[PDB]
């Protein structure tokens, strides 16, 4: 996260850190707890990965340097990557992770609410993006979970900054014309959440953008509302 600040406990209780351990352990991506055994993230977080035994999923963690050998973590039971996701194209950048055991809910470990199918994002005026990603281009993973407030931009305005990618109805964009606030490397798969009438909901999944926090280059997010049939079908069929 570029231009963000340090979060406090319980602000973002759905945020998880998706890490791998081979010989060393590292944070790779963010995710959102959406059910007691389900995390929602980006499909591209699985590109160039070994099988799922490598993954350690941390929830109820604010600060990655607070993690020790004895910190509990979740392991993966199933990975469901959207059937029509193709890496060079980038559309349908969405994936479900089923955990090996359900998590008990606490004030620091709770699921984010999901939107309805058919939702126009025009009612969301207070949106935030969180993660442990770089704080600048060519930067480094941050220890304390970062938060930043970013306005949504219309798909029409977003499309002007991105020839030659098509910005589809299944994407949502967010950024400042002047730049300086954005998601960055290591924030993939994390939440774009908006607060409406006292409650937070997941509007987007952190996906792509040009560099980080550049002028006139908004971040692009998978629009969760446009995949709610898929999310419901896949989690029900699995469960």
């Amino acid at each position: 996260i570029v231009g963000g600040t340090n979060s406090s406990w319980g602000e973002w209780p759905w945020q998880v850190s998706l890490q791998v351990k081979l010989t060393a352990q590292r944070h790779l991506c963010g995710g959102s707890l959406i059910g007691h055994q389900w995390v929602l993230t980006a499909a591209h977080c699985f590109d160039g990965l070994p099988l799922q035994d490598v993954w350690r999923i941390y929830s109820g963690i604010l600060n990655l340097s607070d993690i020790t050998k004895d910190t509990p973590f979740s392991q993966i039971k199933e990975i469901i990557i959207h059937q029509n996701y193709k890496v060079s194209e980038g559309n349908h950048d969405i994936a479900l992770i089923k955990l090996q055991a359900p998590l008990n809910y606490t004030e620091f470990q709770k699921p984010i609410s999901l939107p309805s199918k058919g939702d126009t994002s025009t009612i969301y005026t207070n949106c935030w993006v969180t993660g442990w990603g770089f704080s600048k281009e060519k930067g480094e993973i941050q220890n304390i979970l970062q938060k930043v407030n970013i306005p949504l931009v219309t798909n029409e305005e977003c499309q002007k900054r991105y020839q030659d990618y098509k910005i589809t109805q299944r994407m949502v964009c967010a950024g400042y014309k002047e730049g300086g606030k954005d998601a960055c490397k290591g924030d993939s798969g994390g939440p774009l959440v908006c607060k409406h009438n006292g409650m937070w909901r997941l509007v987007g999944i952190t996906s792509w953008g040009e560099g980080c926090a550049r002028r006139e280059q908004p971040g692009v997010y998978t629009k969760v509302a446009e995949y709610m049939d898929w999310i419901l079908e896949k989690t029900q069929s699995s469960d």
Partner: peptide
């Protein structure tokens, strides 16, 4: 993954 994406080796 293409460079516009945010994983560490994109």
């Amino acid at each position: 993954c293409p460079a516009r994406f945010a994983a560490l080796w994109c």
